[PDB]
Design a protein around this ligand. Structure first.
Ligand SMILES: [Zn+2]
Ligand SMILES: [Zn+2]
Length: 75
């Protein structure tokens, strides 16, 4: 596998990163604010109906989930 040699010394620098509240992913605090703008716009697959719904909408999606929608779009 790998010989037990001295080994390389891995070091880390002090970098303050910000985490999202919707996706909860690691991103640059600088590109965080913006990242959110799109983050929400993104649509995920629901389990009840099975349609693409906005991340931020998923909050109150359950309400319209089941009643709203053309019908059986996909399996
Ligand atoms: Zn995010
Ligand atoms: Zn749904």
């Amino acid at each position: 596998g790998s010989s037990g040699s001295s080994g390389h010394e891995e070091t880390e620098c002090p970098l303050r990163l910000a985490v999202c509240q919707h996706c909860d992913l690691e991103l640059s605090i600088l590109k965080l604010k913006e990242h959110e703008d799109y983050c929400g716009a993104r649509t995920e697959l629901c389990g009840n109906c099975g349609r693409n719904v906005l991340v931020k909408d998923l909050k109150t999606h359950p309400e319209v989930c089941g009643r709203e929608g053309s019908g059986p779009s996909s399996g």
